[PDB]
Amino acid sequence: QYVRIKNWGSGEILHDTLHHKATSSCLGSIMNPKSLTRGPRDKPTPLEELLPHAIEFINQYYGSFKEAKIEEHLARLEAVTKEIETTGTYQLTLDELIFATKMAWRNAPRCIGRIQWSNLQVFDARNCSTAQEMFQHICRHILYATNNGNIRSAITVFPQRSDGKHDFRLWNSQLIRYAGYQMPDGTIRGDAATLEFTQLCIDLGWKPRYGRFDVLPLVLQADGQDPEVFEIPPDLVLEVTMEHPKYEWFQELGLKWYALPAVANMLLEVGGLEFPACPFNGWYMGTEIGVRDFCDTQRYNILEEVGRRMGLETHTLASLWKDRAVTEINVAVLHSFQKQNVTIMDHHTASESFMKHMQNEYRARGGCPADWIWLVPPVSGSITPVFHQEMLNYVLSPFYYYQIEPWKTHIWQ
Amino acid sequence: QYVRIKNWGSGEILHDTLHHKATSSCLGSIMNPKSLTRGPRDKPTPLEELLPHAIEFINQYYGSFKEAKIEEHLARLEAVTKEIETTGTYQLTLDELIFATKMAWRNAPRCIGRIQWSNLQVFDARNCSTAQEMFQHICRHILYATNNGNIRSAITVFPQRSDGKHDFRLWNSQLIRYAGYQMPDGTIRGDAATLEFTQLCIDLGWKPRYGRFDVLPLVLQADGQDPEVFEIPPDLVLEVTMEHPKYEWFQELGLKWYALPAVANMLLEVGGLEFPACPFNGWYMGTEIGVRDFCDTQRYNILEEVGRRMGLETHTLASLWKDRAVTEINVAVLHSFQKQNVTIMDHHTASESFMKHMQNEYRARGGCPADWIWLVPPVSGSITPVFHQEMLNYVLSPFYYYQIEPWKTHIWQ
Numbered sequence: 001q002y003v004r005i006k007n008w009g010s011g012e013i014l015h016d017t018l019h020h021k022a023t024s025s026c027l028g029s030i031m032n033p034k035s036l037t038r039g040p041r042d043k044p045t046p047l048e049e050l051l052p053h054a055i056e057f058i059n060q061y062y063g064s065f066k067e068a069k070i071e072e073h074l075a076r077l078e079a080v081t082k083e084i085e086t087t088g089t090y091q092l093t094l095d096e097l098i099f100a101t102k103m104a105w106r107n108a109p110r111c112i113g114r115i116q117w118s119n120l121q122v123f124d125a126r127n128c129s130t131a132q133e134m135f136q137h138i139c140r141h142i143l144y145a146t147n148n149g150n151i152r153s154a155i156t157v158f159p160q161r162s163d164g165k166h167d168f169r170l171w172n173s174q175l176i177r178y179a180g181y182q183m184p185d186g187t188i189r190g191d192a193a194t195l196e197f198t199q200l201c202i203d204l205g206w207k208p209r210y211g212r213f214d215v216l217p218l219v220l221q222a223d224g225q226d227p228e229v230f231e232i233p234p235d236l237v238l239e240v241t242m243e244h245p246k247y248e249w250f251q252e253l254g255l256k257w258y259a260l261p262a263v264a265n266m267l268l269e270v271g272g273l274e275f276p277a278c279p280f281n282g283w284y285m286g287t288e289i290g291v292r293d294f295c296d297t298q299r300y301n302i303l304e305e306v307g308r309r310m311g312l313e314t315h316t317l318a319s320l321w322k323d324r325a326v327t328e329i330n331v332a333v334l335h336s337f338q339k340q341n342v343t344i345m346d347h348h349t350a351s352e353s354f355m356k357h358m359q360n361e362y363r364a365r366g367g368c369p370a371d372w373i374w375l376v377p378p379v380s381g382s383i384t385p386v387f388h389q390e391m392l393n394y395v396l397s398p399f400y401y402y403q404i405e406p407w408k409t410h411i412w413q
Numbered sequence: 414q415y416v417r418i419k420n421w422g423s424g425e426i427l428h429d430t431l432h433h434k435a436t437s438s439c440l441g442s443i444m445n446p447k448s449l450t451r452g453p454r455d456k457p458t459p460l461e462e463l464l465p466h467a468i469e470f471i472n473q474y475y476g477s478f479k480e481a482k483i484e485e486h487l488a489r490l491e492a493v494t495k496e497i498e499t500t501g502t503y504q505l506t507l508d509e510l511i512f513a514t515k516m517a518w519r520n521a522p523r524c525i526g527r528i529q530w531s532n533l534q535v536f537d538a539r540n541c542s543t544a545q546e547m548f549q550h551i552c553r554h555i556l557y558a559t560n561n562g563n564i565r566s567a568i569t570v571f572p573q574r575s576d577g578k579h580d581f582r583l584w585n586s587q588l589i590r591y592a593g594y595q596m597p598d599g600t601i602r603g604d605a606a607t608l609e610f611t612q613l614c615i616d617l618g619w620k621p622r623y624g625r626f627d628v629l630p631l632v633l634q635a636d637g638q639d640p641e642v643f644e645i646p647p648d649l650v651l652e653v654t655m656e657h658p659k660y661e662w663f664q665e666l667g668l669k670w671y672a673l674p675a676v677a678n679m680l681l682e683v684g685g686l687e688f689p690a691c692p693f694n695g696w697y698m699g700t701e702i703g704v705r706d707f708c709d710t711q712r713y714n715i716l717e718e719v720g721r722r723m724g725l726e727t728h729t730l731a732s733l734w735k736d737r738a739v740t741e742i743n744v745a746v747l748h749s750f751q752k753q754n755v756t757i758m759d760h761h762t763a764s765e766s767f768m769k770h771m772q773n774e775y776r777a778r779g780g781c782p783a784d785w786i787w788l789v790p791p792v793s794g795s796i797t798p799v800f801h802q803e804m805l806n807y808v809l810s811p812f813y814y815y816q817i818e819p820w821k822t823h824i825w826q
């Protein structure tokens with residue numbers, strides 16, 4: 001009929017008709033494509049499908065170590081199929097999970113930091129059973145990963161999807177994230193990008209502090225039950241206050257940001273099995289905060305303000321005052337993280353390391369999936385090596401999929 | 414077998430194997446895809462194919478003006494098919510060509526300036542027959558478009574492809590473009606991106622001036638004969654010398670650039686007909702010169718040099734000295750063009766106008782093909798509106814196709 005097109009800036013929509021008159025239509029510039037999303041279930045995974053996938057993964061796993069172990073491999077293959085026809089699903093051995101979590105990461109086409117893929121702490125919470133236990137595991141994760149500034153990459157894997165109506169899910173987009181409130185005077189305080197979720201939290205019994213940087217609460221759902229609201233212990237949320245190395249009025253903007261970048265709502269697919277709850281984290285890249293979180297119009301939007309305090313021709317696009325401001329903001333962020341001894345990386349050194357990663361990856365296993373639109377930084381694109389690098393974007397497995405917003409598809413006793 | 418991947422930065426190559434283990438492989442990040450290229454011929458266009466295309470175009474054309482002219486439409490349809498079965502091919506009426514050139518432009522998914530699509534001078538050189546006449550038409554084009562700085566968009570359409578072995582072709586990538594020479598001391602002077610073509614020119618009897626900014630000659634081929642070398646009259650090549658509004662040492666870098674951005678080697682497809690020679694031009698966008706031509710490693714590469722003269726920590730990526738330098742370079746360019754009264758636009762105002770264009774385009778004809786990777790500026794991407802804009806990239810018609818390098822596929826009496 002017609003393809004829907006969204007402008008994530010003004011949130012406006014457009015309906016494309018013309019594409020029909022095409023000749024021989026790329027979905028690359030699409031943020032959330034269905035090919036990347038892995039939705040719900042109602043019944044277990046049809047044995048005919050699971051079995052093959054499961055075998056494939058076990059061959060990948062065993063076909064991983066130098067000088068394999070054929071006996072164990074056969075036995076394992078044997079043991080798994082056996083366990084499958086006896087229960088339907090199956091259980092991965094800790095080592096397979098670890099292998100799975102790293103490989104899935106390794107296969108994340110949108111991750112600039114995959115050079116670290118082998119360095120990953122894996123917390124086994126597959127035995128978790130209640131929301132309080134989830135909350136406890138998450139806190140442990142947040143504490144371990146934060147490590148007082150010296151950030152450590154980590155993932156915590158909760159129970160796998162069984163039937164499809166007993167899914168463990170984190171409703172938050174990320175572990176730490178500020179709240180956004182619609183104020184009475186018509187203005188929006190905090191992170192406008194979370195106005196909805198903040199409200200959902202308000203709705204579930206959360207007390208709004210009406211501030212610019214109130215860390216939203218964890219909204220966990222275990223087994224299949226409704227989500228319970230858990231506030232995050234302030235002692236666990238490390239933050240960096242922003243200050244510019246030259247302009248002393250920067251800190252006057254009273255800005256800050258959390259140090260832990262952790263994705264909360266993705267699904268880990270492996271060997272036919274799927275874990276809809278597996279929060280993981282790495283560390284920040286300056287431009288994420290300096291450019292996206294601070295300069296996006298749909299976000300904190302401090303560009304106009306920084307330009308004025310800089311004495312720039314804020315009313316003349318051609319003056320390139322925006323390019324000037326954004327740069328100082330980016331340096332304030334980097335500066336601030338470095339000063340407070342909190343791990344972070346600039347987009348430049350990041351691009352170089354990815355290029356190195358990619359080089360290794362092609363040698364090692366001839367290939368490395370990569371989404372160019374996502375790997376090129378939001379600023380200074382061609383100044384970066386990855387911009388001049390052609391790359392293929394394909395979905396391997398194990399893989400980390402996006403999934404449907406839990407509040408769209410969910411019961412509610 | 415395996416997909417070839419090129420890094421246009423270090424020119425290195427990579428062979429992708431992994432993509433085979435894919436699930437449900439995007440070619441978006443590919444510079445020159447075959448789907449966008451339109452190669453050679455040996456025999457005319459099979460009547461069965463041409464006829465339908467021709468009818469389609471004539472319906473588009475007539476189905477263009479408000480309150481159509483059914484009589485003329487039928488007559489025209491009638492007249493064309495008639496002319497087709499009598500000659501094989503057919504001739505477009507000046508108005509159809511004009512309509513075709515604008516629509517093709519309108520359908521260029523990689524053009525940030527399509528808001529100007531209706532403003533276009535069309536030079537009818539379909540009667541051209543010799544290389545000297547091509548040279549004359551080109552000179553006229555260069556003179557008209559340059560207009561002493563007040564740049565005007567223009568295209569000159571030479572004879573259409575007949576059999577396939579009587580093609581008019583410009584061997585140059587663009588009308589004006591500096592030469593690159595491999596020096597005896599191992600260094601490369603001028604534009605390294607034209608080392609090959611410069612040599613080809615040398616080979617065809619061109620005298621190399623061994624300078625940093627020697628405008629390469631026109632290498633025209635008419636009918637089907639070999640290419641003849643025509644040097645461009647210096648009086649016709651307008652240039653802007655670079656100088657920074659604050660740093661007076663900028664002009665000490667002794668830099669400049671031509672004012673006329675004109676593509677020379679593309680092919681215009683319309684109504685089944687194809688014109689392999691139709692140089693066209695618009696005006697420059699600062700970042701093209703300041704960022705790509707001056708800061709690309711494979712080009713003039715003046716970033717390192719500008720950073721030092723700025724007194725930046727040139728040996729510390731994290732300092733973001735590159736982001737600082739690039740900005741001043743961009744301002745020098747804009748500044749210099751403005752000072753010398755030569756049309757140019759900054760990437761910011763450009764992005765805003767495209768967004769407006771796109772808005773109009775969807776309203777008018779519900780859709781507007783757009784290649785995101787090409788529309789987002791090489792620097793300050795997310796600071797621009799088009800970065801947050803989702804878009805579809807499809808090939809309509811009439812369209813401007815890329816084509817195979819003439820020196821790869823050509824006779825040679």
Ligand code: HEM
Binds near residue numbers: 280284288400
């Ligand atoms: C060790 C440092 C790491 C760094 C610096 C890093 C950095 C990044 C950055 C900058 C993005 C861009 C996100 C955006 O633009 O929204 C990203 C995406 C991604 N990363 Fe990494 N990462 C790291 C570790 C990890 C780990 C440990 C995993 C998982 C095991 C991982 C999985 C992913 C995935 C799935 C995406 C896509 C997220 C999405 O599409 O929203 N990364 N990462």
Ligand code: HEM
Binds near residue numbers: 524701
């Ligand atoms: C009036 C002002 C115009 C401006 C400012 C403009 C600007 C641009 C820019 C900045 C690009 C990017 C090129 C690159 O990154 O290599 C581009 C591409 C393109 N433009 Fe425009 N343009 C204009 C007029 C035109 C005209 C008159 C035509 C043709 C009738 C046209 C056809 C195209 C095509 C086919 C491309 C793709 C070129 C390629 O793929 O190499 N443009 N233009």
Ligand SMILES: N#Cc1ccc(C(=O)N2CCC3(CC2)N=C(N)c2c(F)ccc(F)c2N3)cn1
Binds near residue numbers: 262
């Ligand atoms: N609008 C908005 C918006 C979106 C995401 C966030 C956010 O907190 N995100 C944190 C996670 C995010 C992306 C930024 N940033 C990272 N370094 C990162 C990481 F280290 C590992 C894995 C990821 F998937 C990562 N993506 C904040 N605001």
Ligand SMILES: N#Cc1ccc(C(=O)N2CCC3(CC2)N=C(N)c2c(F)ccc(F)c2N3)cn1
Binds near residue numbers: 697
């Ligand atoms: N390496 C390299 C390299 C490539 C192209 C050029 C060059 O001269 N190009 C001039 C034409 C180029 C792209 C830049 N720049 C434009 N504004 C432009 C235009 F106004 C109309 C149509 C185009 F297709 C256009 N593309 C210089 N160096």
Ligand SMILES: C[C@H](O)[C@H](O)C1=Nc2c(nc(N)[nH]c2=O)NC1
Binds near residue numbers: 008030031375800
């Ligand atoms: C529309 C456009 O694709 C989108 O707004 C962009 N967002 C992102 C992106 N790249 C990253 N890293 N993160 C994003 O969210 N690419 C482009």
Ligand SMILES: C[C@H](O)[C@H](O)C1=Nc2c(nc(N)[nH]c2=O)NC1
Binds near residue numbers: 387444
């Ligand atoms: C590899 C990468 O796609 C390529 O080097 C880039 N070149 C260009 C681009 N965008 C424009 N406008 N021009 C280019 O030549 N997109 C990216």
